[PDB]
Amino acid sequence: MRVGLVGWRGMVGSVLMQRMVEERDFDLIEPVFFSTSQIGVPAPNFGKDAGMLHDAFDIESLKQLDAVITCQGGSYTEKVYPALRQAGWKGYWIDAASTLRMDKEAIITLDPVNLKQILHGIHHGTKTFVGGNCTVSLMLMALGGLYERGLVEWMSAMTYQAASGAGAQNMRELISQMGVINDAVSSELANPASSILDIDKKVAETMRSGSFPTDNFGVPLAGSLIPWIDVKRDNGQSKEEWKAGVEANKILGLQDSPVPIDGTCVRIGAMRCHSQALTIKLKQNIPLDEIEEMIATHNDWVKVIPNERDITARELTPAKVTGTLSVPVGRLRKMAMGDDFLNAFTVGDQLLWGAAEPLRRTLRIILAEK
Amino acid sequence: MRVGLVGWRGMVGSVLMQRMVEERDFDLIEPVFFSTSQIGVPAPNFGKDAGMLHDAFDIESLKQLDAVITCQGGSYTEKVYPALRQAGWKGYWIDAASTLRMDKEAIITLDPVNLKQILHGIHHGTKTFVGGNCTVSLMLMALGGLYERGLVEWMSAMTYQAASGAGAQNMRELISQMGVINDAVSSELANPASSILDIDKKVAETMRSGSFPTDNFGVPLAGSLIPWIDVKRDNGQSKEEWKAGVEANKILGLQDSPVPIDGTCVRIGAMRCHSQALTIKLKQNIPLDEIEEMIATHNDWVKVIPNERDITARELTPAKVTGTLSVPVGRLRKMAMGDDFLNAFTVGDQLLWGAAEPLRRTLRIILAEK
Ligand SMILES: NC(=O)c1ccc[n+]([C@@H]2O[C@H](COP(=O)([O-])OP(=O)(O)OC[C@H]3O[C@@H](n4cnc5c(N)ncnc54)[C@H](OP(=O)(O)O)[C@@H]3O)[C@@H](O)[C@H]2O)c1
Ligand SMILES: NC(=O)c1ccc[n+]([C@@H]2O[C@H](COP(=O)([O-])OP(=O)(O)OC[C@H]3O[C@@H](n4cnc5c(N)ncnc54)[C@H](OP(=O)(O)O)[C@@H]3O)[C@@H](O)[C@H]2O)c1
Ligand code: NA
Ligand code: NA
């Protein structure tokens, strides 16, 4: 199978390339690498010689592929995909971008949750497979066990989203902001006798100052938060908040009887893990031990963290999870509202299960089943 | 009125002293300053000469006061308060500490919400007035308008709590952690061609390394979060999470018909503002304009931020709120679960309304009404 890689050089793409090298995915395919800025120079060598970088916008080049895996983004998909399909291309389009998620001809791919749906699509002629929004995917990797048993009546999701979700430059800005904060008070920090109110005054001044690097975020992220992600929608939701409901219900095949999913999506000063605090209304009073088992046994990556203080602090954090495929979920307990209310807190890496991982896994499923 | 100040030198105390200087509170009282480490040296001059620092543990000194305002902490109150009352002291005890909050002889003081309760207490012989938990106070300052009309059926609160809540040393640690993160990748940050994955790898390594300053938190806060605050309780709540329900219902005088309040309390890398994402179940379908008006008109400090993207990013953040008495609340909208579900996101300064402000205000109310 001849497979085109688009957007391989960027952040999501680079994570994908690393994982494909680790799992030796290139042994299984004839890779063809594409570019927008380096067309015609030698392609990267990830174990296999793929020749030259091809033109990402050249429909005649793309047409010759059996599949495309693209991490290039929505603008690219909007330009290229319709032209490709119109040209009669029947190849597999595997996409990180949100563009085609809600298209009737596309399946949102998160195989530990919806493998059967993916297999059914492959059998019955589906050629477009799209990764879900990072938040949706990470939530379902954590709570798949509850959703598959149809136990969720509704869910409120308050998120703690890392800078990586906004982009590589936003991550860089976060770290730079951290540096500027510390620089402003490094002297008083080194002095044990210094006043916390003096330190605080300078930190606040610095974060507000013109010189504080805010070109990407518009406002500080380090030392703060931003309770709005993506464009506004008519009902008052941000696009990020809206994605959860429509995408999860499509993945789960519940579009005829959708689970209400809503909440506030908040950007915090984490590097590359998204965390979520969930109020989960269940249809039945189910004992906590049974809930924990249902959750734990759903997939190989979810990890139930015992509701104890010290283990939570060590395990249920971005610092622990970053750069790993582990999806810990903890603080599992019934809430004051009733024994059909379940509290959960989960953390997952935004670039792995939230981006790159479903793409490479979908490739392997297609290879086995086509 | 002869008023003792205990814990005036610490973080909360220092904020209190600043506010008392700003509002010229010392004109109204004969201040007597106490100490544990500098007994017998000249007291601070905040406009008035108060003589020498007295022994904070000397019951014979405390007995001579008409009132005590203490920011010293729970350990101090546990040691001193029972002995003071047993000695027949009938003075006013105004306390930042959690110790006496749930005692039947004490009123939790948050006058923009419960002035009438405070006045009734003063009239009928209450001598102990205690500030509520920072999270509870800040939530009620935002949502007082809804709670006073008895419209809240239940509320789920997912918090974003600043380092200041844990203490001055924890704030210092947060900033130091930020510095260490930036130091590790400052070179690659200055290089536009550097790889985000290389930067990420080093940041992750650094946060995990032994040398990362974590003596106070135990784990990283900068670049991460900690979804556990304070000791575990039997039902699986942390003490911080438990405080919300019992304290809010006492403030509101609803102990006979309590509103269920629960959620997860999370420490994030903010300096001194606590933020909260709330799922509020209302008893009635009330139009959003009416909800906004009810909220906005409750008190002088709550600020309804329009549910628009750019204004939210500028106004509804720790960076905006820090060091001010403003309590913005935004993202006000009906949720997917139904028109009796209300989403709200609020930010408030932890040291002002969450600590120092109710103490000085209670002093003034007592002076007027006694
Ligand atoms: N302005 C922005 O912040 C912006 C821009 C792009 C994407 N995005 C978002 O990010 C998602 C795409 O994932 P991503 O974050 O992985 O995209 P990304 O990092 O921006 O990479 C996408 C493409 O940009 C090119 N690129 C430009 N400068 C680069 C650099 N310094 N290092 C590596 N590649 C560079 C590369 O294509 P070539 O090899 O052909 O040069 C790469 O394949 C999209 O869904 C989109 O929403 C935002
Ligand atoms: N180990 C801890 O992290 C610890 C310690 C204390 C309080 N707390 C918590 O914090 C709350 C009290 O508020 P807070 O945070 O304002 O307390 P704080 O900053 O620790 O100040 C409380 C007292 O500690 C003394 N102190 C010791 N070192 C100091 C320093 N370097 N600068 C100024 N004062 C110093 C002061 O008393 P003197 O003037 O008599 O020396 C001060 O009044 C309590 O509710 C408690 O839970 C925690
Ligand atoms: Na700036
Ligand atoms: Na350490």
Side-chain angles (χ1 to χ4, degrees):
Chain A
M1 198 172 70
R2 199 168 149 198
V3 180
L5 294 311
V6 192
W8 58 267
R9 201 172 66 91
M11 184 170 68
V12 171
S14 287
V15 174
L16 179 63
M17 296 304 100
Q18 284 180 341
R19 291 287 300 124
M20 290 180 75
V21 169
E22 281 168 5
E23 301 306 319
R24 294 187 61 181
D25 291 335
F26 291 107
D27 293 5
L28 303 174
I29 58 162
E30 185 186 322
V32 180
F33 292 91
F34 289 79
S35 185
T36 61
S37 67
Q38 310 178 264
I39 301 160
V41 307
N45 191 107
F46 293 121
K48 220 167 203 166
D49 188 283
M52 305 298 135
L53 289 173
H54 299 256
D55 185 356
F57 294 106
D58 180 8
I59 305 299
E60 305 312 307
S61 296
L62 294 160
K63 272 160 68 176
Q64 297 193 7
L65 305 163
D66 299 310
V68 170
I69 304 176
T70 174
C71 301
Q72 188 67 24
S75 187
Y76 174 81
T77 298
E78 286 171 3
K79 180 67 189 175
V80 161
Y81 180 84
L84 208 42
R85 292 297 185 211
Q86 279 163 28
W89 193 69
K90 301 291 188 286
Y92 295 92
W93 183 270
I94 306 163
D95 199 351
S98 63
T99 307
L100 307 169
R101 280 177 198 157
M102 302 314 292
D103 185 277
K104 67 165 181 288
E105 294 187 336
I107 283 168
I108 308 174
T109 182
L110 189 64
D111 73 84
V113 172
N114 72 339
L115 178 64
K116 288 190 192 75
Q117 189 184 73
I118 296 165
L119 293 172
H120 179 89
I122 293 163
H123 299 150
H124 294 268
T126 304
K127 301 296 180 185
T128 304
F129 299 88
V130 191
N133 193 246
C134 58
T135 57
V136 184
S137 306
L138 294 173
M139 182 275 291
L140 288 181
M141 287 297 296
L143 298 182
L146 295 167
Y147 277 99
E148 73 160 336
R149 284 170 182 83
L151 292 168
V152 187
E153 182 183 329
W154 56 256
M155 192 190 71
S156 185
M158 305 305 184
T159 73
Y160 304 65
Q161 295 177 226
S164 68
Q169 292 302 134
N170 296 77
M171 300 175 62
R172 295 175 73 118
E173 182 163 299
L174 170 65
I175 307 158
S176 292
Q177 285 183 358
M178 288 187 178
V180 178
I181 289 171
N182 180 262
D183 286 347
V185 292
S186 60
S187 297
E188 28 280 290
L189 247 29
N191 172 205
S194 65
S195 147
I196 189 59
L197 289 196
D198 285 348
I199 293 164
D200 175 69
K201 194 181 181 292
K202 289 189 184 193
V203 167
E205 275 194 42
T206 300
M207 289 171 57
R208 285 159 172 165
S209 72
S211 69
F212 207 67
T214 56
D215 287 357
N216 293 286
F217 285 112
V219 291
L221 183 60
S224 199
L225 50 71
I226 315 161
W228 198 300
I229 298 170
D230 216 329
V231 298
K232 188 182 176 173
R233 287 178 69 87
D234 290 349
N235 69 358
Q237 282 181 310
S238 71
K239 196 180 183 179
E240 190 77 2
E241 294 156 1
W242 162 82
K243 278 174 175 172
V246 296
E247 290 187 25
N249 286 292
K250 181 170 171 167
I251 290 162
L252 295 163
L254 295 173
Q255 292 169 308
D256 290 347
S257 197
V259 177
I261 296 161
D262 208 355
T264 301
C265 294
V266 184
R267 185 79 66 206
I268 67 153
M271 300 302 314
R272 59 175 278 182
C273 291
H274 285 10
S275 310
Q276 299 180 60
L278 315 158
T279 307
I280 313 155
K281 177 69 184 290
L282 302 170
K283 292 177 187 182
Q284 295 177 54
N285 185 7
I286 300 138
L288 189 56
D289 280 343
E290 286 169 30
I291 286 169
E292 286 177 33
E293 178 73 356
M294 284 166 43
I295 289 172
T297 61
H298 178 260
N299 68 77
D300 300 339
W301 300 271
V302 64
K303 191 185 186 191
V304 174
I305 307 305
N307 192 32
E308 304 292 333
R309 185 176 189 187
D310 290 358
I311 192 160
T312 297
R314 288 181 303 200
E315 293 281 329
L316 199 57
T317 71
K320 171 70 184 186
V321 178
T322 184
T324 80
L325 288 161
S326 186
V327 184
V329 53
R331 311 301 320 277
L332 292 163
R333 57 177 187 90
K334 300 304 180 67
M335 305 177 84
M337 290 83 81
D339 290 328
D340 51 355
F341 284 79
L342 174 72
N343 177 275
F345 191 91
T346 184
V347 184
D349 187 279
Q350 178 266 315
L351 295 169
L352 289 158
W353 281 117
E357 202 66 23
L359 312 177
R360 61 159 301 276
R361 287 180 66 90
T362 303
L363 172 65
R364 287 208 173 211
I365 297 160
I366 291 163
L367 287 162
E369 201 66 24
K370 73 183 179 72
Chain B
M1 198 172 70
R2 199 168 149 198
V3 180
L5 294 311
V6 192
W8 58 267
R9 201 172 66 91
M11 184 170 68
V12 171
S14 287
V15 174
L16 179 63
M17 296 304 100
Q18 284 180 341
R19 291 287 300 124
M20 290 180 75
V21 169
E22 281 168 5
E23 301 306 319
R24 294 187 61 181
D25 291 335
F26 291 107
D27 293 5
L28 303 174
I29 58 162
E30 185 186 322
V32 180
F33 292 91
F34 289 79
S35 185
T36 61
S37 67
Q38 310 178 264
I39 301 160
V41 307
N45 191 107
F46 293 121
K48 220 167 203 166
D49 188 283
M52 305 298 135
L53 289 173
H54 299 256
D55 185 356
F57 294 106
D58 180 8
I59 305 299
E60 305 312 307
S61 296
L62 294 160
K63 272 160 68 176
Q64 297 193 7
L65 305 163
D66 299 310
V68 170
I69 304 176
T70 174
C71 301
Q72 188 67 24
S75 187
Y76 174 81
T77 298
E78 286 171 3
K79 180 67 189 175
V80 161
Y81 180 84
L84 208 42
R85 292 297 185 211
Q86 279 163 28
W89 193 69
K90 301 291 188 286
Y92 295 92
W93 183 270
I94 306 163
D95 199 351
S98 63
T99 307
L100 307 169
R101 280 177 198 157
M102 302 314 292
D103 185 277
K104 67 165 181 288
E105 294 187 336
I107 283 168
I108 308 174
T109 182
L110 189 64
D111 73 84
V113 172
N114 72 339
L115 178 64
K116 288 190 192 75
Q117 189 184 73
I118 296 165
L119 293 172
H120 179 89
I122 293 163
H123 299 150
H124 294 268
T126 304
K127 301 296 180 185
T128 304
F129 299 88
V130 191
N133 193 246
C134 58
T135 57
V136 184
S137 306
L138 294 173
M139 182 275 291
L140 288 181
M141 287 297 296
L143 298 182
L146 295 167
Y147 277 99
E148 73 160 336
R149 284 170 182 83
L151 292 168
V152 187
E153 182 183 329
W154 56 256
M155 192 190 71
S156 185
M158 305 305 184
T159 73
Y160 304 65
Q161 295 177 226
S164 68
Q169 292 302 134
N170 296 77
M171 300 175 62
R172 295 175 73 118
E173 182 163 299
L174 170 65
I175 307 158
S176 292
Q177 285 183 358
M178 288 187 178
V180 178
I181 289 171
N182 180 262
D183 286 347
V185 292
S186 60
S187 297
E188 28 280 290
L189 247 29
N191 172 205
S194 65
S195 147
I196 189 59
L197 289 196
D198 285 348
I199 293 164
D200 175 69
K201 194 181 181 292
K202 289 189 184 193
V203 167
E205 275 194 42
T206 300
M207 289 171 57
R208 285 159 172 165
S209 72
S211 69
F212 207 67
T214 56
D215 287 357
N216 293 286
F217 285 112
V219 291
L221 183 60
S224 199
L225 50 71
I226 315 161
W228 198 300
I229 298 170
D230 216 329
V231 298
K232 188 182 176 173
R233 287 178 69 87
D234 290 349
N235 69 358
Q237 282 181 310
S238 71
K239 196 180 183 179
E240 190 77 2
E241 294 156 1
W242 162 82
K243 278 174 175 172
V246 296
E247 290 187 25
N249 286 292
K250 181 170 171 167
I251 290 162
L252 295 163
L254 295 173
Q255 292 169 308
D256 290 347
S257 197
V259 177
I261 296 161
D262 208 355
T264 301
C265 294
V266 184
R267 185 79 66 206
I268 67 153
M271 300 302 314
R272 59 175 278 182
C273 291
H274 285 10
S275 310
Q276 299 180 60
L278 315 158
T279 307
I280 313 155
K281 177 69 184 290
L282 302 170
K283 292 177 187 182
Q284 295 177 54
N285 185 7
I286 300 138
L288 189 56
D289 280 343
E290 286 169 30
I291 286 169
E292 286 177 33
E293 178 73 356
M294 284 166 43
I295 289 172
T297 61
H298 178 260
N299 68 77
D300 300 339
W301 300 271
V302 64
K303 191 185 186 191
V304 174
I305 307 305
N307 192 32
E308 304 292 333
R309 185 176 189 187
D310 290 358
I311 192 160
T312 297
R314 288 181 303 200
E315 293 281 329
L316 199 57
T317 71
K320 171 70 184 186
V321 178
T322 184
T324 80
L325 288 161
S326 186
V327 184
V329 53
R331 311 301 320 277
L332 292 163
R333 57 177 187 90
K334 300 304 180 67
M335 305 177 84
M337 290 83 81
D339 290 328
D340 51 355
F341 284 79
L342 174 72
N343 177 275
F345 191 91
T346 184
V347 184
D349 187 279
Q350 178 266 315
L351 295 169
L352 289 158
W353 281 117
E357 202 66 23
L359 312 177
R360 61 159 301 276
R361 287 180 66 90
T362 303
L363 172 65
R364 287 208 173 211
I365 297 160
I366 291 163
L367 287 162
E369 201 66 24
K370 73 183 179 72

